Amino acid sequence: EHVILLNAQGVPTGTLEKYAAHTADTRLHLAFSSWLFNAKGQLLVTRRALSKKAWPGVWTNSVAGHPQLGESNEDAVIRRCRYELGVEITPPESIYPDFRYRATDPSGIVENEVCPVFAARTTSALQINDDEVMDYQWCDLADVLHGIDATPWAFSPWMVMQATNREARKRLSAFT
Amino acid sequence: EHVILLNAQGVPTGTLEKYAAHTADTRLHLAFSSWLFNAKGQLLVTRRALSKKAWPGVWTNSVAGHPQLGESNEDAVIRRCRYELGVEITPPESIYPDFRYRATDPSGIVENEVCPVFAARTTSALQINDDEVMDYQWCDLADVLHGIDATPWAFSPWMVMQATNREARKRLSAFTQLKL
Numbered sequence: 001e002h003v004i005l006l007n008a009q010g011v012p013t014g015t016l017e018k019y020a021a022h023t024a025d026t027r028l029h030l031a032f033s034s035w036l037f038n039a040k041g042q043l044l045v046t047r048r049a050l051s052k053k054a055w056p057g058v059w060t061n062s063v064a065g066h067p068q069l070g071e072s073n074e075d076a077v078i079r080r081c082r083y084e085l086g087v088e089i090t091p092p093e094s095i096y097p098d099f100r101y102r103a104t105d106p107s108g109i110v111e112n113e114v115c116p117v118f119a120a121r122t123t124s125a126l127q128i129n130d131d132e133v134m135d136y137q138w139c140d141l142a143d144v145l146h147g148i149d150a151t152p153w154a155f156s157p158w159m160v161m162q163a164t165n166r167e168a169r170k171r172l173s174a175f176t
Numbered sequence: 177e178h179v180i181l182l183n184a185q186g187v188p189t190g191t192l193e194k195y196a197a198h199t200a201d202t203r204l205h206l207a208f209s210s211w212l213f214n215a216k217g218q219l220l221v222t223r224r225a226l227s228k229k230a231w232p233g234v235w236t237n238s239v240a241g242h243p244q245l246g247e248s249n250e251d252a253v254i255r256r257c258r259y260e261l262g263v264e265i266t267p268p269e270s271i272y273p274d275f276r277y278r279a280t281d282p283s284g285i286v287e288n289e290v291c292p293v294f295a296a297r298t299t300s301a302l303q304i305n306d307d308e309v310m311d312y313q314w315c316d317l318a319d320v321l322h323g324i325d326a327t328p329w330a331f332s333p334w335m336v337m338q339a340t341n342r343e344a345r346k347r348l349s350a351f352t353q354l355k356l
């Protein structure tokens with residue numbers, strides 16, 4: 001498992017093993033983020049396990065990860081959905097293609113990522129991997145957005161940025 | 177370091193070392209909770225360190241803990257503000273003296289408490305103890321209660337229980353006024 005190093009524009013230039021890649025000095029690399037809703041249209045919010053190297057125990061959007069060499073983003077989303085949440089989904093759709101971001105977690109670990117965002121529908125029940133997810137909630141995107149809007153700090157900075165982007169937010173609410 | 181065990185009545189019967197006291201079988205014990213406001217009237221919200229035995233890495237109100245033998249609840253609040261936040265405060269005001277709660281944390285640790293709740297004002301800078309607190313925010317009370325109303329699952333339930341109590345809530349409003 002690797003992350004794909006990106007140059008100034010997003011051209012891959014190499015790889016690092018995923019664990020060695022996330023440090024206090026994390027270099028720019030490829031990523032994705034996805035927002036999952038159920039058939040009923042509830043938003044799935046997850047809490048990252050205490051063993052995640054970056055933002056452990058943080059409430060965030062449904063699923064995020066790092067596409068591997070030669071892997072489509074949509075495939076990356078599907079893979080991590082199965083891996084973290086043991087869940088099957090509809091074909092992921094673009095919600096925030098240009099999302100890119102850098103931040104530092106309370107322990108000083110950095111994530112530095114070009115991160116296209118997607119939305120999709122689960123088509124199966126969840127089967128949680130507790131090495132990745134320590135908790136989750138099915139809720140209403142409206143309340144979730146109220147929450148991000150009221151107390152952003154209660155949530156991952158990445159989740160907050162995606163939901164604060166006008167386009168992404170409008171797309172998530174129409175997805176719903 | 178211990179907790180003060182209480183019988184069915186809220187009456188002390190002795191003590192138990194703190195760590196050992198908090199398990200899946202936690203006995204009723206004495207505790208406290210405090211909501212801290214700075215001079216501006218902003219509420220301090222904190223994120224419990226990852227190493228906390230109960231609700232590690234969870235967002236909650238400013239400070240909480242266990243009064244020790246011979247110590248008053250109010251001196252408890254004061255000591256813990258110093259210990260966890262390194263911050264001095266005004267005399268803790270009682271805002272929810274009869275709060276009592278039981279809850280199981282994401283890993284099964286139970287907390288079972290008689291937990292009088294206080295509010296105070298800080299009178300010094302923070303010196304966060306990262307053995308106890310991994311993150312904090314200064315914010316507007318109304319915002320926090322909106323976050324609490326919207327996604328209550330994103331916070332420790334104790335903060336939520338205390339905050340949805342009408343009088344404790346009104347008392348907390350009193351501390352949002354600026355004060356020099």
Ligand SMILES: *[C@](C)(CO)CCOP(=O)(O)OP(=O)(O)O
Nearest residue numbers: 031032064065066111113115158
């Ligand atoms: C970037 C947006 C956030 O760091 C996505 C990375 O997700 P993460 O869950 O940390 O990666 P994995 O461990 O591959 O799931």
Ligand SMILES: *[C@](C)(CO)CCOP(=O)(O)OP(=O)(O)O
Nearest residue numbers: 207208209240241242287289291
């Ligand atoms: C009861 C309200 C919550 O469990 C107070 C105990 O909180 P905690 O901060 O975990 O106690 P200490 O470890 O003594 O600080």
Ligand SMILES: [Mg+2]
Nearest residue numbers: 063064065080
């Ligand atoms: Mg992930």
Ligand SMILES: [Mg+2]
Nearest residue numbers: 239240241256
């Ligand atoms: Mg405490």
Ligand SMILES: [Mn+2]
Nearest residue numbers: 031111112113
């Ligand atoms: Mn990464």
Ligand SMILES: [Mn+2]
Nearest residue numbers: 207287288289
């Ligand atoms: Mn306790």
